[PDB]
Design a protein around this ligand. Sequence first.
Ligand SMILES: NC(=O)C1=CN([C@@H]2O[C@H](COP(=O)(O)OP(=O)(O)OC[C@H]3O[C@@H](n4cnc5c(N)ncnc54)[C@H](O)[C@@H]3O)[C@@H](O)[C@H]2O)C=CC1
Ligand SMILES: Cc1cc2nc3c(=O)[nH]c(=O)nc-3n(C[C@H](O)[C@H](O)[C@H](O)COP(=O)(O)O)c2cc1C
Ligand code: SF4
Ligand code: FES
Lengths: 85, 213, 430
Amino acid sequence: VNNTKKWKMEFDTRERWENPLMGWASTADPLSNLVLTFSTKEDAIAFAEKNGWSYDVEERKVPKPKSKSYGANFSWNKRTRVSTK
Amino acid sequence: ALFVHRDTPKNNPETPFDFTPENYKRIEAIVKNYPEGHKAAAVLPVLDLAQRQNGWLPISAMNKVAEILQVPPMRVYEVATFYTMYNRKPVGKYHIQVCTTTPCMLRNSDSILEAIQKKLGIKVGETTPDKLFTLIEVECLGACVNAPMVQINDNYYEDLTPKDIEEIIDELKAGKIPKPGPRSGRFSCEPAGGLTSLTEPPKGPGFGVQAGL
Amino acid sequence: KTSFGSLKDEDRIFTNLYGRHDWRLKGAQSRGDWYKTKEILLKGPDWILGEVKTSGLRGRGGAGFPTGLKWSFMNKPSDGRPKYLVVNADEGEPGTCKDREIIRHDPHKLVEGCLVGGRAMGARAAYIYIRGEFYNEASNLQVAIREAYEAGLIGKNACGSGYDFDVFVVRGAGAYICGEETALIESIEGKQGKPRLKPPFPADVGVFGCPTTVANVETVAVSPTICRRGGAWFASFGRERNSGTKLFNISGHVNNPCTVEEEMSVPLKELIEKHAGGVTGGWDNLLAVIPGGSSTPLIPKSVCETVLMDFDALIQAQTGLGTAAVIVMDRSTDIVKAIARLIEFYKHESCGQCTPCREGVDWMNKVMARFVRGDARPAEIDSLWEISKQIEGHTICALGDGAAWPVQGLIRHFRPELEERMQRFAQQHQ
Ligand SMILES: NC(=O)C1=CN([C@@H]2O[C@H](COP(=O)(O)OP(=O)(O)OC[C@H]3O[C@@H](n4cnc5c(N)ncnc54)[C@H](O)[C@@H]3O)[C@@H](O)[C@H]2O)C=CC1
Ligand SMILES: Cc1cc2nc3c(=O)[nH]c(=O)nc-3n(C[C@H](O)[C@H](O)[C@H](O)COP(=O)(O)O)c2cc1C
Ligand code: SF4
Ligand code: FES
């Protein structure tokens, strides 16, 4: 989960077409490889507003806390018994 | 030796296996030893009953045990491949198991293994062509003071010399059954030169019972 | 008391150890079994736990956990779930055949122990997980259990005490790891014998999810004798924290390979030279002794002169007491072949669940198979030492410990012999 720590700013992907000679992926978008890295969301929004970029923001998705019990795998009367191990 | 299965004409899910009706009564008695809701605990005794009926387990005994206990068939396949008594291959009528761990190797179990090999003409893992004997080489059978020893399907034949195990295989070839015990002078596990202990008569009831009881 | 051993026949718990008397109910009652069992059941669980805690009885399975402290973990009110005694009767340890003799020749002592132990812990029934290879022993135990049900000694209103207690026998199917208590619990549940992690302990979540005690045959069968004779009688033997009598299995290179009951802190030399007829070729023919079964590290001949056969003296000899199954090895033994066969046992008896045992025990077997031939170089002894240390303590159960320990004992006491094996391989093959 170490790549999920920082806020990124990317852009909309524009056209990538085929090179007539070699079949390579040609582009005309200069900002197609431009990915920035921010410590917080607010730094990212301030940088986007400072540069006049229209932005939209997804909130951070953290995994919810789970109730892990190794004893639940061997219960007396619950469906959460494992059939094998 | 393989822990995957392939369908052969002798071993496939259309191979005919079914329990006998008295085996169904014994399965009912097995299942009534476990709590309601944990009928899956009867997988090992019912699969052992299927092996004692059929001699080995085709993959129709595993599926029948999976059906009559309402467990998934993979959870019977796991048990049949985990434990070394379940014969997934058809073994001979006398499945000889020579113990060759360290307490039996120290008392020359290699002599008995070589004697069984040159007596039957087979090696470890092979079956005689008349399907009477299968020789394998097992771990500790828990008869270490009676080393060296073998096991022939249920019975421990103990304190053996190569002459003893050749006599046992001879009178198994004659249709008879030998006596499951030590082949020396002693009876179960005592010292061979007489008892070093328990020579006095036992004290009976009430000896040394404390006060307040 | 300073000198231990020479146990008299009046203090033998396991009379009819050798099959010389009747094992059935009329013979067991005529030797003292099932005597005043109703009174023991009516005196309550706390009294039986106090008699086991007073006796200094440690767990005869091989780990030596205190039996009364262990059984008091079940002394708690019910939470809707039933409670169970589970009697460990697998005994797959090479060297060890004592539980076979208890089940086969004193079965009613084991059944009365099931009743008394399961009374002390409030247990509903007893599941004796016997080894599958002990088929005649299991039927022997079933005949005794039928005789105990028919006499009213177990079952509905057991011994007339109003405490209902069943006794079941579950047979194994050829897995040494199914004597490990959580793997045995999983094997009763119809699954692969793979050890559960700890915690949950079996007193919290054991067989079927219920509160459970897994106890050895020998620590169960001595408990009616402890509750009849008193805990102080049983604590009068052995050293302190090392009380009682112990069954010993002297096998290997001795004159008279035997099973014998002896006092706890008996010397090893006294046991071998008294009950086994001594080592073949004399005491000077002794090379090394595996003291208590295959899981314990061996001790060389210099340690065997003075060491006592209890838990603490063998821990001070940097081995363990274990199952108290004495494997004696003389000077005519290739000890590297014997320890490598022991590690070959431990990789054939390994369930494959966790990574250190599944991988490292096979890798220790390959290194030890090269060490028998000497197809190695002496940096690989320290390599195998570190591999044993990586397996030890990092596994789920103690079969990883029990596989790492004989390698460590072999290295620790016979590194020069391993080195000369490898250098004669190196000189005659190059
Ligand atoms: N008797 C035989 O045939 C064999 C015996 N062994 C012996 O097994 C031993 C290893 O067995 P283990 O059970 O893994 O050893 P040990 O660490 O776990 O514990 C022994 C007993 O104490 C109980 N216990 C310990 N701490 C506890 C706690 N905090 N709460 C509740 N219960 C607790 C365990 O449940 C177990 O029943 C080895 O020393 C070896 O000598 C090994 C192989 C075969
Ligand atoms: C791999 C392994 C195998 C074991 N096998 C047995 C066994 O066969 N019989 C036994 O009584 N204890 C065996 N034990 C020890 C048990 O885990 C447990 O300590 C014992 O059975 C019950 O505890 P007790 O000593 O108080 O009776 C084994 C332990 C391990 C790690
Ligand atoms: S260490 Fe070995 S015996 Fe234990 S859980 Fe792992 S595979 Fe099983
Ligand atoms: S070593 Fe062969 S029976 Fe235990």
